[PDB]
Design a protein around this ligand. Structure first.
Ligand SMILES: NC(=O)c1ccc[n+]([C@@H]2O[C@H](COP(=O)([O-])OP(=O)(O)OC[C@H]3O[C@@H](n4cnc5c(N)ncnc54)[C@H](OP(=O)(O)O)[C@@H]3O)[C@@H](O)[C@H]2O)c1
Ligand SMILES: Nc1nc(=O)c2nc(CNc3ccc(C(=O)N[C@@H](CCC(=O)O)C(=O)O)cc3)cnc2[nH]1
Ligand SMILES: [Mn+2]
Length: 159
């Protein structure tokens, strides 16, 4: 099965100038929890924004160009990316915008964090049809001393 995981600010903004302007340790812990010991697929720009391999995960990078780092796996198409994951129960697609758009039609599950932040971005999560999805988990958290915005963890499954 293919799953997308993403954190969305207001108006589905997910990035600006190849960074995530906010800082929510609780959300990154949620990301780690849900991706550890699974393959993660990302686009080249997201790979460059993270800046190093994610430990405890098979890192698969999509690029039309040859690889530049043998600590991770490089692939040249969506189908190759999926194949490189091997026979696993769950493949995690971790962005960015252009990668999300391509994998969304193939995905069975969305792990979404809705962040109460107004950020002017240049990258958005794709505009998905709500009728195709059912919410099976929702958990809201107020801002605290560590997390500067309120946020909601949601898991959607394709109906
Ligand atoms: N808030 C979140 O949850 C979240 C998560 C991830 C990323 N981001 C943010 O999203 C932004 C980056 O997203 P982005 O849309 O600009 O770029 P991206 O999706 O991360 O990567 C785009 C690149 O992936 C490569 N590639 C993509 N699709 C391919 C395909 N079908 N076949 C072969 N190669 C392919 C291309 O690399 P080449 O040009 O080398 O061919 C393309 O330029 C950043 O701001 C980042 O911080 C946010
Ligand atoms: N929900 C969600 N939040 C995110 O911020 C997020 N970010 C990306 C891509 N960007 C990044 C940037 C940094 C790290 C990162 O340093 N992760 C650490 C967490 C460290 C910790 O647990 O405190 C990791 O090991 O996973 C991951 C993804 C993709 N999906 C996401 N999904
Ligand atoms: Mn059903």
């Amino acid at each position: 099965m293919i799953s997308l995981i993403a954190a969305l600010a207001v108006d589905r903004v997910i990035g600006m100038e190849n960074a995530m302007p906010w800082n929510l340790p609780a959300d990154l812990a949620w990301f780690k929890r849900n991706t550890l010991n699974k393959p993660v697929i990302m686009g080249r720009h997201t790979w460059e924004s993270i800046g190093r391999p994610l430990p405890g995960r098979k890192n698969i990078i999509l690029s039309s160009q040859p690889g530049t780092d043998d600590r991770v796996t490089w692939v040249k198409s969506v189908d190759e990316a999926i194949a490189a994951c091997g026979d696993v129960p769950e493949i995690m697609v971790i962005g960015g915008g252009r990668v999300y758009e391509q994998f969304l039609p193939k995905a069975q599950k969305l792990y979404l964090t809705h962040i109460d932040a107004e950020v002017e971005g240049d990258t958005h999560f794709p505009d998905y049809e709500p009728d195709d999805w059912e919410s099976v988990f929702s958990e809201f958290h107020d801002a605290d001393a560590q997390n500067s915005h309120s946020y909601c963890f949601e898991i959607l499954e394709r109906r």
